[PDB]
From a paper:
Adenosine triphosphate (ATP), the fuel of life, is produced in inner membranes of the mitochondria of eukaryotic cells by an embedded molecular machine with a rotary action, called ATP synthase. Each monomeric unit in the dimeric bovine enzyme described here is an assembly of 28 polypeptide chains of 17 different kinds, organized into a spherical catalytic globular domain that extends from the inner [name] membrane (IMM) into the [name] matrix, attached to an intrinsic membrane domain by a central stalk and a peripheral stalk (PS).
As it rotates, the asymmetrical central stalk brings about structural changes in the three catalytic sites, found mainly in each of the three β-subunits, which alternate with three noncatalytic α-subunits in the spherical extrinsic domain. In the current structure, the postphosphate release angles are 28.8°, 26.2°, and 25.5° in states 1 to 3, respectively. Therefore, the rotational angle in the F1-domain is not influenced significantly by interactions with the additional components of the intact enzyme that are absent from the isolated F1-domain. During catalysis, it prevents the dissociation of the α3β3-domain from the central stalk by clamping it in position from above, and it resists the rotational torque of the central stalk, preventing the α3β3-domain and the rest of the stator domain from following the direction of rotation.
Author numbering:
A (entry chain A): 384 to 509
B (entry chain J): 8 to 54
C (entry chain H): 15 to 146
D (entry chain D): 323 to 481
E (entry chain G): 1 to 272
F (entry chain I): 1 to 47
G (entry chain F), I (entry chain E): 323 to 479
H (entry chain C): 384 to 404, 410 to 508
The structure:
């Protein structure tokens, strides 16, 4: 709920200014940001085939996406980020994922841990 | 009832033919330019 | 009294202002305009313009080229092509540009090329002198 | 229609020939976006083949999206990147055409059989930009990509 | 038509409306930017014109060489901008050649060239394109003036026609005289101006030429963007009316098709 | 008569050169803005 | 519909009256492009009659082709030949309208008959461009073309 | 088969760039397309012998008519036949009997068209 | 379609809940302009009620039209007799929202059942301009107009 409310709101904002996507430039900064965030989010919702995701993985990925931590990455790279990043958390950080899963919510401590994890992984990606 | 991409040229009305020609003239011109450059490169690389 | 108008193509400084003195550098040697200067129409040279406000306050803008028209009714139109206040400029960069232009000077493919190059030297010398 | 609509569910692969593409002279008029196969998965054909195919389909769909704009602006007013998409899309549209050995009577050309690796290489190169200087017509009705290069050379020589 | 004809037409018009709305928004943004930039350029160009209206100069009545410059752009879809400019340009050219002159033409922007390539096709001294893609600068005016002076058609009089930008909805077509030093020197009014040899005056004339070209470019781009915004608004409105009519027709046709197929089924069932 | 006029140049070219010489010596941040509002993009078609 | 569609095959000359045209005020609302005839043959009507009829039809068909773009993009995104075609086609459309005597009661106008030679001459003149300086509403509902010229002169006043 | 093939290619290219109306190449392409189009027109109950069709289409497609205005093409067409049908019956008989444009037949056709175009 | 074409023959009014107004936090999300009524007639609802309703509809339409200008030319382009209408229309939109007694677990307020005279007087006063000095948010989710006054006092002090 916490992450999907913001994701849905941002996607709705993006769907009413998607027509300008071809133009994009030569428009205000607000619509530039809307287009950028929308493209990142759509590239996030892409999924493979026969590769479902546990809820903790989905929430981690969408949380990274909807807080701006991908506004620097180029869209073509997002589908790679999403991939590699996920493996990282699925290997290094199992305690946080288990906390989110069993608890069911994102506690403030878990929110801080996700912030640190996303920044640390994104701080060195390339 | 909705609309989809690439519909102006699916109707084939007047806008469809107009768009087809606007595309074809431009790419004929660019093909001519590229062919001229290709001939020039041919000659300059013969040696 | 003066009706000064100092306007770059991009930004405009004084519009129909009423200043006191304007020291401007033109092709035929710099000079100064006061309330009832004789009508002239000169073409600026890479120098700097000093405007003394209606009082004793002075402001300096570096002008790269333009034209100054002093009309009969004490209206001065000083249109520059790139008038930038001094604070926006760099010092050592001017020296580097001046030296590189001098270096290219000897490589004078023809007369007009040399004229171009040492116009660049002229402008860079004016810049360094203004900042020196 | 009920008949083809029902028949769709009984086939593994389909190749929806399209009249809108046959009018353009692209033969066989197979529609690249309305055709599908079951084996078309990265685990059956390979990741290179799959990625090339999906890149071609995506570029053609983007071309369709752009054709609506070009009908109002014109090619002259497109972002210098969009013109690149249009050029690649037209090259790919022409390069899918091929001369059959049974359609000698119509076209008069000669039939070509293109091995799978050569098709994958040709389209991967056309997408990668290794041919964004050859004109579009060089790619029309030719087998492998090298034949397109040779046809372009002939076009330039007799220019 | 049939239901598929109507469906395809309706989809096409919906796409066209979407595109025209987006183009209206883009044109509005560019118009705001161009107006913002036009203010300082407005004052600058008016100041550069100052002299000729302060010391009135009457063009010589014994010369035949004239220049017509027409500022517009390459972009279309801007309504009666290029049309008005070219119309007045040919009006002036006809008047001059009837009074007995040797007129040339410089076209800043393709559309003027195109409108005038049927008649006046041989008077093109030189024409510039690539206008309108990005906002005009002083570099463009300097280039135009430089390629005018270099092209050794020493003219004896000049005129520039551009679309002065009045309001967001309205614009006017102007003609601003351009004089050569042969006229400035031979003016009693210029006797007063001090330190006025024929070399500083020549440089001043070149600079004023660049200035007037730049002023016309800024005014023309502002008015062109405003006109494109207005034209796109009207085109989107017309597409909306057409979409409404076609949607009504599509609903009628869909219901008629349902009824027709159902009556066929009923007749077949009852005819056994 | 300046030297450059003895070379057959015109004051527009002189102003261009001086503008380049003055716009290249700005604080590094100012150069990005100075690139705008300067530099032509016009083309000339031979007639 | 099956009924008119079947009747079409039993007729020498047709005259498809149209509601679209009648809404423009043109009267009789004959659609010049749906109407046909068996004797529209250069060996029966002539060569000036046939040539004029075909020129009128060609210009009207060109105008019909342009109409869809004119309706959205506006009549400004048209070449000069296309604007000339639009103006000529509108002049011709109005000129085909006529005031009948049986409608004297409806509109108060005066009924007009237009001998064949006058019709052919007037359309020849409109086609050649002899009347490009007149306003298109100078042809709306008139007998021979000289009445159109008189109407234009009165409009000038 | 020889002539209509090139005519088919020329009309196919013309139809692509026809919806509008610059450069020399495409301007001449449109010119050739229009010339051929006005060539293909015909009257009623006046079918033409195959060799006469070949002559007319050859004249049109070998860039000869590109000089003429298009509104006049029909004239040429008609006139041309009434010339060839009397003076050059032998050439038409040759084309019919041999059923091909041989090299000598092509050279003749060439000189006939070149002479007739100027004289008209 | 025959179903709504037949039901609409019987309707004596209409309410149009809109997703576009629940986004704004206005509740009930009744589209003020798309809603219709047969008895909105001065002979039935009275001249004062009819005039207040017509004025509110007109001002809301004016604000809707002005919103395009705001989105394009920017808020600066307005006159002073148009910025005032924008402010009045925003206040009216806020006042049309209400808190329901059956939604006290969604709004944190206490439901109000506003009589009719209170509604008419509130909108008459807002249209007259008697409350132009208050903030817009002082009208959001309140009962009668006096509650708007009290909210303004409580949030400003």
């Amino acid at each position: 709920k916490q992450v999907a409310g913001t994701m849905k709101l941002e996607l709705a904002q993006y769907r009413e200014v998607a027509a300008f996507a071809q133009f994009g430039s030569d428009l205000d900064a607000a619509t530039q940001q809307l287009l950028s965030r929308g493209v990142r989010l759509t590239e996030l919702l892409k999924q493979g085939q026969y590769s479902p995701m546990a809820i903790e993985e989905q929430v981690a990925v969408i949380y990274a996406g909807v807080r701006g931590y991908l506004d620097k990455l180029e869209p073509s790279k997002i589908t790679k980020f999403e991939n590699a990043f996920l493996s990282h958390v699925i290997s290094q950080h199992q305690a946080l994922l288990g906390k989110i899963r069993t608890d069911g919510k994102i506690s403030e401590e878990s929110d801080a841990k996700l912030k640190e994890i996303v920044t640390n992984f994104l701080a060195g990606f390339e | 009832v909705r609309s989809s991409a690439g519909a102006v040229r699916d109707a084939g009305g007047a806008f469809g033919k107009r768009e087809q020609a606007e595309e074809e003239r431009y790419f004929r011109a660019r093909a001519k330019e590229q062919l001229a450059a290709l001939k020039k490169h041919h000659e300059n690389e013969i040696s | 009294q003066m009706s000064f108008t100092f306007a770059s193509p991009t930004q405009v400084f004084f519009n129909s202002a009423n200043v006191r003195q304007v020291d401007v550098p033109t092709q035929t040697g710099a000079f100064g305009i006061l309330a009832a200067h004789v009508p002239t129409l000169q073409v600026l040279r890479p120098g700097l313009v000093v405007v003394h406000a209606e009082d004793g306050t002075t402001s300096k803008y570096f002008v790269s080229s333009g034209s100054v028209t002093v009309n009969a009714d004490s209206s001065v139109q000083l249109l520059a092509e790139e008038a930038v206040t001094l604070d926006m400029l760099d010092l050592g960069a001017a020296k580097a540009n001046l030296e590189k232009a001098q270096s290219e000077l000897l490589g004078a493919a023809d007369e007009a090329t040399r004229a171009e190059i040492q116009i660049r030297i002229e402008a860079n010398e004016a810049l360094v002198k203004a900042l020196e | 229609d009920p008949a083809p609509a029902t028949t769709f569910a009984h086939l593994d692969a389909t190749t929806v020939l399209s009249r809108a593409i046959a009018e353009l002279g692209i033969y066989p008029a197979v529609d690249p976006l309305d055709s599908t196969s079951r084996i078309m998965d990265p685990n059956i054909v390979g990741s290179e083949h799959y990625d090339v195919a999906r890149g071609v389909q995506k570029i053609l769909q983007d071309y369709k999206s752009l054709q609506d704009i070009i009908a109002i602006l014109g090619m002259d007013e497109l972002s210098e990147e969009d013109k690149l998409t249009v050029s690649r899309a037209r090259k790919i549209q022409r390069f899918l055409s091929q001369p059959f050995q049974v359609a000698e009577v119509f076209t008069g050309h000669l039939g070509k059989l293109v091995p799978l690796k050569e098709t994958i290489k040709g389209f991967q190169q056309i997408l990668a930009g290794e041919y964004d200087h050859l004109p579009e017509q060089a790619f029309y009705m030719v087998g492998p990509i090298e034949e397109a290069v040779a046809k372009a050379d002939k076009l330039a020589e007799e220019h | 038509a049939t239901l598929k004809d109507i469906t395809r037409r309706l989809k096409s018009i919906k796409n066209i409306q979407k595109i025209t709305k987006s183009m209206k928004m883009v044109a509005a943004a560019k118009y705001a930017r161009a107006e913002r930039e036009l203010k300082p350029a407005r004052v600058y160009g008016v100041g550069s014109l100052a002299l000729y209206e302060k010391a009135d100069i009457k063009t010589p009545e014994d010369k035949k060489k004239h220049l017509i410059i027409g500022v517009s752009s390459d972009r279309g879809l801007c309504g009666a901008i290029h049309s008005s400019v070219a119309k007045q340009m040919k009006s002036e050219a006809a008047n001059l050649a009837a009074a007995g002159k040797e007129v040339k033409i410089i076209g800043v922007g393709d559309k003027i060239r195109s409108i005038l390539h049927r008649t006046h096709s041989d008077q093109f001294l030189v024409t510039f394109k690539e206008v309108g893609r990005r906002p005009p600068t002083f570099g463009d005016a300097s280039v135009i003036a430089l390629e005018l002076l270099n092209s050794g058609y020493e003219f004896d009089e000049g005129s520039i026609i551009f679309n002065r930008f009045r309001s967001v909805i309205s614009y006017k077509t102007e003609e601003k005289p351009i004089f050569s030093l042969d006229t400035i020197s031979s003016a009693e009014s210029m006797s007063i101006y001090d330190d006025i040899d024929a070399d500083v005056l020549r440089n001043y004339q070149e600079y004023s030429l660049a200035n007037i070209i730049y002023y016309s470019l800024k005014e023309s781009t502002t008015s062109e963007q405003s006109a494109r915004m207005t034209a796109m608004d009207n085109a989107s409105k017309n597409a909306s009316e057409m979409i409404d009519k076609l949607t009504l027709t599509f609903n009628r046709t869909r219901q008629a098709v349902i009824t027709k197929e159902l009556i066929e089924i009923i007749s077949g069932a009852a005819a056994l | 008569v300046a030297y450059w006029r003895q070379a057959g140049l015109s004051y527009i070219r002189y102003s261009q050169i001086c503008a380049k010489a003055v716009r290249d010596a700005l604080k590094t941040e100012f150069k990005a803005n100075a690139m705008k509002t300067s530099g032509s993009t016009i083309k000339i078609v031979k007639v």
